Symmetry: D2
Subunit: 336 residues, 4 copies
């Protein structure tokens, strides 16, 4: 039975989820029945057709009344800031993909359930009250049919976890510290102006901006063996998309650059295929734009000094995450 | 008699109004008694001390309870989104500088008057209901004591009007069309996302973005003789500050590059001194950052072909406009 | 009769000429037999495969000894700064596409002829000695079989000329002044450093930079009727690709916005089809990236005030020009 | 006896050396007697007066014939690409500050000595044949009167060495790996074009670009205790100036975040004062623009997990290094 999905927050993640669904041929047994944002149908259709970071949408998009028509599929357009008022029950919604950035707790995201939706996937780290936190390819097996509000973790955690898992299995990680150099996002500002975070109040276009992230510690939620073993922070830089994870960790035994790279190569070819990739070419961040993988390990950058290991992975923070959202949706509805 | 002033919206314009006041030694007989924004005093103080576009504030800023202290002057900090609830009558406010971007009509901005303020200057084009629209140096003479809500026009209009006035008097403008190449502002977005304007919905950092502006037609409000003679549009480009007006017009008689430049040079040395400047050096936009003039005519760019004339003027859209706000405040309170 | 072509200077224009040739299915009866630059085959192949502005090359590129193999075609790679030493005669070169920026006169470009090449097309405005200057779609009819060194004009002139030609025929242009807001190019600098042009010595990333261009006057070379009637300058802004022509002109008779737009729509559908395009959608510069047209007229921006008319056209300064180089190559070898 | 200095290569470093000398009141007993570049005196004077990254020069610059006059000091302007032809003997030059980026070995930089100069300081890592490599504040004691060609190391090594030295002394470093997120430099490119380094061949403005750096290994040259213990690489990001060192190392014993910060605070107040600074404010990269320190340690970013420690230091890669060049100049001439 096809899963009926709606996207609440038709932004970078929300739109790129819809785009990923259509660009991959609707591989997932999913039908997008509705989207909700602040704009009218003309605005949502226009932003779907033309994108700066990802170019023009391959398919056709037209407007017909209250509907945005994508490759012949009529998708109802809503503009209501309050989730509890959205007509999810009447549309028979199975899963709400919550991508506004404003309802990341189970209490807040549960407003969709009052509206009549069966389940909700938060497109960000959730509050402590969420039923599960999922990095697809790593721990989707923990999902249960009773789960109703889950988190798909962060783009950073979806890159770090598939990177660290094979290294912990074969070498073991005693402890690790991570820095992610990350593209700016729409929570930042063009020129200095009010923000809750004093550093994010500074022009994203002009500076390297340190900001806190829980992505490294959050790997403990998806891989419990690494709980308490990873910490880190982010440096936001003036790029529109694509980010880099830079993980330094102390391994349990001595290792080499060649062994470390071999471990990740085997993982990319086997268990973690299409989630983790292995790259040996002299590439830059833009070359991974529109790459759907969660973690693009760059073997060219690996450094080893005794037990200290530095591994680096590129990730399209919009495209990889958005494709994983569709994967997690199918897993949640299939979970027993 | 010192004018008691408050800033509603302590953003790019609001903060640089306060900065300009203190950097020039409080030359204007003005005391900034309070500011209002969304943040706490610590946030407003930090953004005052450090700015990307304009560097570090020369003076001292400290926090004391609900007050921000700038060079020993205690300034009350407020955070209330509703202007009618602000305690302007209790603070004895003479003039409210409205810089939020949300109350640009006389009806909406009049909420300050109910709160107890005597007068309001909107830092943007006002609605048709405003008492006056002022480009200081051009038409402040129209101000009256009965005026309570006025507009200081736009940054673009404050640049275009002093440029076009001297040319009209000596050569005459049959008609004119204008393009302003303009730095991005906080109304724009970092990566494509909802906006009321479909072009402003596109990444400011990556594209030249056409947007409508009323600055050219608005020159008719300040100079009725030019009403109906100027039109134009804007192109937003990826710069953090400083913009350029590019005016092409048909003069009433044939002229030359040398005559055009001489007319504006004379205006800069006399009637329009310090509002309009005359530049002959081979400079770029960043060289006009922190220039307080409304219109920096660049003589090196002048082109003339018979009756057609192209003149260009640089303007710091934040710094020049913010200084003009202080000028218009004194003029408004002196009006008889 | 397949034309044997070589690219001297495998830079932005040189590489995108080859990309354009393979992406359109080698529609032109052209075979690129060799390229010349400063690097080894590994470097030229890598830059062919991955590009920031235009993304991944759709085809396959490999290296085999001194050859770069593109979709099965073996292309000799040379690294010699002196054209007279290049092996054009042994390769049977019909046309050298001169894209280094260093041999822009007939005397300098003639070094290729000494090397054994029959003809040379300079990818930029030529010196006074060049045999012809060509904007394809406008004046390729002037080419003659005895011509040996020609110029393909500038990107700007290839945008302006197809725009102004239909307007002169239907309305007449008395005179006009133009401003082109233009992406930075590799002759500019990242942070202030020596340059012959003192304004181009300033950071391209941080400022709007006025620079002289002969593109407007050069329209007289391709449309002699307009000789002496057009002048202008450029403003380089921080975008990596895609530029805008903004032409203000006095028409010979009064007109309207609707009539101006109709004239250009008819031309785009007829005589100038695929060279000039007609756009009515609310787009920004990035949306014309990888558009092969020479001039993408934006009807949404048209302004008319009496006789003064402002028309604006977008152009991909790399992609449109590079596609026109292929057209002009065929036209040159077909000339009788 | 005042040290007579000349600058060979009046670029980012060369010009900022002169600006640092004059802005700090010519504290050093140094007189800049001449500069050498590719341009004429008017071009060099203009670039001295106006800078994008560092704003306008506080002093006065005029041109008089072949001389540039800075705050009343006559400085000879030369334009000769071969050091052996420069008239250093006739000018009585004590020290040549070699800042072109083209003569970084002792053999190449020795051409200045044949030109008649007594000594040469390379403004970059030197070849292995250089007499010494100096991080001022760390190992200037090794300088000798017989030294004639030395290296002032790299901006990165001058930031890393003062950061790591106090931590090694009090805690001990078993091993360490470094990442420096670094502003782009004029060696990189605006849009993809030939470069010896295939990643630096990619647009600096659009991507995060991994590049090799010897800064980590080079700390072994200035502190033999650390030879072989540090390795790393750099990531160039789209910022015009200011960089960040991110050092992860395994300490010999367990420690805490507070202890690490205390060691560096004591070092900043004592042995390494004015070389190393201690910051506790929530700042971003631009806030350290024009900071003369070699290493601006940011205590807010420190992370510690047992023996694994991650410390971060900001450095203005132009301004800090340029000021250190003046320090090293005096130390070299004072050496016995
Ligand atoms: N962009 C990334 O790199 C990235 C990666 C992983 C996760 N995320 C997470 O995804 C979420 C969305 O981030 P984004 O970058 O897509 O943000 P965005 O600002 O691009 O998009 C948010 C969208 O939601 C709309 N919106 C806001 N409030 C709304 C409301 N009350 N009701 C309906 N629509 C509303 C906005 O108009 C906008 O279209 C956040 O939780 C973010 O942390 C982002
Ligand atoms: N920036 C320019 O170049 C420029 C030039 C001329 C005029 N203006 C005009 O000035 C106004 C301000 O623009 P800006 O560039 O400073 O924008 P901004 O976003 O930098 O500043 C807006 C400020 O108002 C605050 N704010 C928002 N809603 C508020 C509310 N209800 N109550 C109190 N504070 C509130 C925000 O937190 C922010 O500090 C706009 O009307 C704009 O068009 C701007
Ligand atoms: N980029 C544009 O927008 C554009 C548009 C139209 C025309 N043009 C013209 O095309 C020409 C090249 O511009 P570009 O943007 O491609 O510049 P570029 O700097 O990207 O490319 C120049 C290439 O030539 C190589 N080169 C330099 N000297 C050489 C020599 N002696 N022998 C062989 N190769 C050499 C360089 O390594 C580089 O690959 C110029 O005349 C320019 O004005 C550029
Ligand atoms: N800019 C930095 O952040 C930085 C920091 C530390 C070290 N460095 C090093 O300093 C050196 C200079 O780098 P930069 O960033 O100032 O480079 P740059 O490209 O800004 O400046 C180089 C200057 O040298 C001139 N020049 C070139 N060839 C010349 C010649 N033959 N004779 C005279 N002048 C010549 C150029 O015109 C230009 O003015 C390099 O070795 C670089 O690695 C740079
Ligand atoms: Mg009240
Ligand atoms: Mg030969
Ligand atoms: Mg000599």
């Amino acid at each position: 039975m096809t899963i009926r999905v709606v996207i609440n927050g038709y932004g970078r993640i929300g739109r790129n989820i819809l785009r990923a669904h259509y660009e991959n041929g609707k591989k997932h047994d999913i039908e997008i029945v509705a989207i909700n944002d602040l704009g009218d149908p003309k605005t949502n259709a226009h932003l779907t057709r033309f994108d700066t970071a990802h170019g023009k949408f391959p398919g056709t998009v037209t407007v017909d009344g209250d509907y945005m028509v994508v490759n012949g599929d009529k998708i109802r357009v809503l503009a209501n800031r309050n989730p509890a008022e959205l007509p999810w029950g009447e549309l028979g919604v199975d899963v709400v993909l919550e991508c506004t950035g404003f309802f990341t707790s189970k209490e807040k995201a549960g407003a969709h359930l009052k509206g009549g939706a069966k389940k909700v996937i938060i497109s960000a780290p959730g509050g402590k009250d969420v039923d599960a936190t999922i990095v697809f390819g790593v721990n989707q097996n923990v999902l249960k049919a009773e789960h109703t509000v889950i988190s798909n973790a962060s783009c950073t955690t979806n890159c770090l976890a598939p990177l660290v898992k094979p290294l912990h299995d074969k070498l073991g990680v005693e402890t690790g510290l991570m820095t992610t150099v990350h593209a700016y996002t729409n929570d930042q500002v063009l020129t200095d102006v009010y923000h809750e975070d004093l550093r994010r109040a500074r022009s994203a276009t002009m500076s390297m901006i340190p900001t806190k992230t829980g992505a490294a510690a959050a790997v403990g939620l998806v891989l419990p063996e690494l709980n308490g073993k990873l910490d880190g922070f982010a440096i936001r830089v003036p790029t529109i998309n694509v980010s880099l994870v830079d993980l330094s960790f102390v391994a349990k035994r001595d290792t080499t650059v060649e062994e470390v790279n071999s471990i990740l190569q085997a993982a990319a070819e086997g268990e973690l295929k299409d989630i983790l990739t292995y790259n040996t070419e002299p590439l830059v961040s833009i070359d991974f734009n529109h790459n759907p993988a969660s973690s693009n390990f760059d073997a060219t950058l690996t450094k080893v000094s005794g037990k200290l290991v530095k591994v680096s992975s590129w990730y399209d923070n919009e495209w990889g995450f958005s494709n994983r959202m569709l994967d997690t949706t199918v897993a949640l509805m299939s979970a027993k």
